[PDB]
Design a protein around this nucleic acid. Structure first.
Lengths: 143, 117, 201, 64, 17
RNA sequence: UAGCGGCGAGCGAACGGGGAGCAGCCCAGAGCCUGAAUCAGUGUGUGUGUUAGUGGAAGCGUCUGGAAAGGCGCGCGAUACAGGGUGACAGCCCCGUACACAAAAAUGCACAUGCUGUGAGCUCGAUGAGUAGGGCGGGACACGUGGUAUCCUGUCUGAAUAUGGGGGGACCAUCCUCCAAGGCUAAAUACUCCUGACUGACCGAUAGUGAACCAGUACCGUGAGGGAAAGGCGAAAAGAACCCCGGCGAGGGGAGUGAAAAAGAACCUGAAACCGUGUACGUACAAGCAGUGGGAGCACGCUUAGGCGUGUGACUGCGUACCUUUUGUAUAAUGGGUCAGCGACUUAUAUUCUGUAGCAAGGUUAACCGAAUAGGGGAGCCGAAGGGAAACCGAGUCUUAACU
């Protein structure tokens, strides 16, 4: 059946071939117009170039700064909160659970919903939604 | 996968030269010149497909006019009688009748004259 | 479903999902194309104007001559040196998702069963490493283009089928979609089918 | 090689929920005595990038 | 079949100035 | 990504995580015990490899043909249908291949066993000074002197020494960590002038190395240096004895060889431009992109005796090449003497969008392992939650003392 296999319709387009004949449509520079920078080989202007006018990313001021604490913190969805180990949640073994990352040191719990089995969190932060969710489920909060 | 174009090129060139056969000088021997003639010949053929209809139309009108004058009536007057008499014979037939059947064409004008009168 | 035998007529149990799923034409084709591409080695390389032997000397000055402007004898539009886009040695292998690859095998296996190109039999072995024995054991079975997929590789069977070209012997691990489709018939063993079930899952 | 983000742009635009970019108005750096308090107050909050320049921005930093 | 190697300098043109 | 940067163009890590591969020791010193291990330099023996090789299965009959390996019919071997040659395409005609064997001699590697040289272990002690550091000038560090740590150096200075010293990105204190200024060290990695084997959705003589033919040759240049063109008769030379014209020629005509001599060495096929011969038609009173529409006559073929086909084309209507570039070209604007061959949107790696396929709040692995396009590997990346400069907050958030 090797000579019977065919691809799904619309899976292929055959690509566009430039400068091949008249009836192929896009010949004569293959749809890049007449003279200019765009018509030349290797032409074009770098990203953000505005014809010599001051680029937008140069007109606008720079502001803010990068916080390193933000890189080592993550938010844990309430959905996966019960997927770590039975019904106990702790800073340890989350990296083993692979839901935050080895480098992540801090951690917070966010309201994601769809939590049924009661769980216990130690050392985490459970603001208001997940706190109500687990308490209704039958969990507890301790530091 | 190197692709040679020797075979295809000759096939295309022969096809043009075949259509250019009969032309004068290099127009039938040289591809670079024969191609122009074939294209230009195509334009004229397309143009003449329409000019032919009008050339024959005017040729027929002249024949009908000559027959009408010979038989004593202008072409314009003759066409009026046929229109008034409701005769749908076209120019091609009227010219055909005039050349071959004189008696028939005489009958045409007599009714044309009658219709005008 | 139930896989009918021809010698023992012993019932076989196989997961319906992995042997009765519809035939995904598009998925099978993509896997086959991917397998064919992976077979290449892309062992091809040409030389651009930079790599062509010669010198950068201008054949003639750049003005006054009644000849076209030339920069070097290595230009692509010049005889004996060129190739504007010379090929490089590159790999044509295409990534195929594990689920997509597994899904294709399930589709092919289902199709072969439907077209009765797959036959399940008991152990298929040869007492001695002789091609005649294998040939006779297939002629009586009326098999000419067959794939002997066995649970475990056996040296006697392997040697017997090595000379034959229409007959090919492989293990369950060593199976590819292209070979399965190409071969007219495939005969499995009970152990081979069982191990196919579990690793497909 | 992977695309190189324009460092200048990365320090002036942040991605938002719906794919837009926010920036700071370019008139609140110096020469502020002559500027009316109303104008200064309006320039303080961040603003969304216009559609016309959005195409240029996304090209500059395609990774954010 | 060597292509002409030495091409002489073109004759100076008439001054159209 | 963090950072560096006329904060422009651009440059661009580390920490940490997953793999490949793993190995640690000596001197700055005395004593006790003394081949005490591990090495290096050389013998003998064992194993294996390299430098010559050997055996290696199995087909005949008919048809076409110059000749079969092909067609048709019936057989045989195969741990040998990988390849090459053989008068057209060979598993069974030959060389080989699978497979099983072989080295007098010279050598590589892995072991065992000797000789020579250097050398364990224990105790105690020591523990690298014009150095670290500093001032001035430069360099390397992703980090351009900037708040600039760290390393290196030209120049000028200059400690402590373990109750001591260095680093932890200005710096200080508290803590943590390490011990510079003396050396050696296999493997994981990089490359291929050269040799062997095998492979190719690589080329097939203007391609492929510049060079398929004694090519880096002829040739060019004082020299450094540059640098071509040129493959093919046939299965086998059987390469044309002999006769005739001709100048004891060239070249040709017969004969002869061959399946073929318009395969005759100027040799497979033999295209186009270009140059000729023959036949048919037109053309010496007629003006111009040379054609197209109409169309008489003539010369050849058909079936019918009416015309259709082919070639030519008197005469007549219309009609100022092509490309490029331009508001605009027959333009007296550019380009082309013609033919043949070659000649220009590709490739890699990222990102965005569209189509299609798989899976689905999940999706997918990279390196690497792997008798290996399978299967492992989930490090990591993307997504479901955003707001704010940030802390931080969280289906809310920021702004503000606070928001109708």
């Amino acid at each position: 059946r090797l000579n019977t296999l065919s691809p799904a319709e619309g899976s292929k387009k055959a690509g566009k071939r430039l400068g091949r004949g008249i009836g192929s449509g896009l010949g004569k520079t293959g749809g890049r117009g007449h003279k200019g920078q765009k018509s030349r080989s290797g032409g074009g202007v770098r990203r953000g170039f505005e014809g010599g006018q001051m680029p937008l990313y140069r007109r606008l001021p720079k502001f803010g700064f990068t916080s390193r604490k933000a890189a080592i913190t993550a938010e844990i969805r309430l959905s996966d909160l019960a997927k770590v180990e039975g019904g106990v949640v702790d800073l340890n073994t989350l990296k083993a659970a692979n839901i935050i990352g080895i480098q992540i040191e801090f951690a917070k719990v966010i309201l994601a919903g769809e939590v049924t089995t009661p769980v216990t969190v130690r050392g985490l932060r459970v603001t208001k939604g997940a706190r109500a969710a687990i308490e209704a489920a039958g969990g507890k909060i301790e530091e | 996968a190197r692709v040679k174009r020797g075979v295809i090129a000759r096939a295309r060139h022969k096809k043009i030269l075949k259509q250019a056969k009969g032309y004068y000088g290099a127009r039938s021997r040289v591809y670079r010149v024969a191609f122009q003639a074939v294209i230009k010949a195509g334009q004229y053929a397309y143009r003449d497909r329409r000019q032919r209809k009008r050339q024959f139309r005017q040729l027929w009108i002249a024949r009908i006019n000559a027959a009408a004058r010979q038989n004593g009536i202008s072409y314009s007057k003759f066409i009026n009688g046929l229109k008034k008499a409701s005769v749908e014979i076209d120019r091609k037939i009227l010219a055909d009748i005039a050349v071959f059947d004189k008696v028939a064409f005489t009958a045409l004008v007599e009714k044309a004259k009658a219709a005008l009168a | 479903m139930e896989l009918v035998l021809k010698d023992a007529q012993s019932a076989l149990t196989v997961s319906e999902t992995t042997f009765g799923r519809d035939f995904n034409e598009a998925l099978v084709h993509q896997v086959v194309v991917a397998y064919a591409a992976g077979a290449r080695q892309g062992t091809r390389a040409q030389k651009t104007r930079a790599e062509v032997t010669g010198s950068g000397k201008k054949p003639w000055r750049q003005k006054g001559t009644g000849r076209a402007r030339s920069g070097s004898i290595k230009s692509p539009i010049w005889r004996s040196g060129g190739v504007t886009f010379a090929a490089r040695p590159q790999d044509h292998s295409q990534k195929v998702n594990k689920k997509m690859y597994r899904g294709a095998l399930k589709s092919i296996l289902s199709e072969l069963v439907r077209q009765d190109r797959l036959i399940v039999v008991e152990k298929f072995s040869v007492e001695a490493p002789k091609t005649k024995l294998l040939a006779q054991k297939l002629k009586d079975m009326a098999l000419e283009d067959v794939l002997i997929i066995t649970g475990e590789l056996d040296e006697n069977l392997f040697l017997a089928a090595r000379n034959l070209h229409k007959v090919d012997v492989r293990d369950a691990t060593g199976i590819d979609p292209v070979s399965l489709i190409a071969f007219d018939k495939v005969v499995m063993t009970a152990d081979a089918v069982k191990q196919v079930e579990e690793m497909l899952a | 090689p992977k695309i190189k983000t324009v460092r200048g742009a990365a320090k002036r635009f942040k991605k938002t929920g719906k794919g837009g970019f926010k920036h700071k108005h370019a008139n609140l750096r110096h020469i502020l005595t002559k500027k009316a308090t109303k104008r200064k107050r309006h320039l303080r909050p961040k603003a969304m990038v216009s559609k016309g320049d959005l195409g240029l921005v996304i090209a500059c930093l395609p990774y954010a | 079949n060597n292509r002409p190697v030495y091409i002489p300098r073109p004759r100076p043109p008439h001054p159209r100035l």
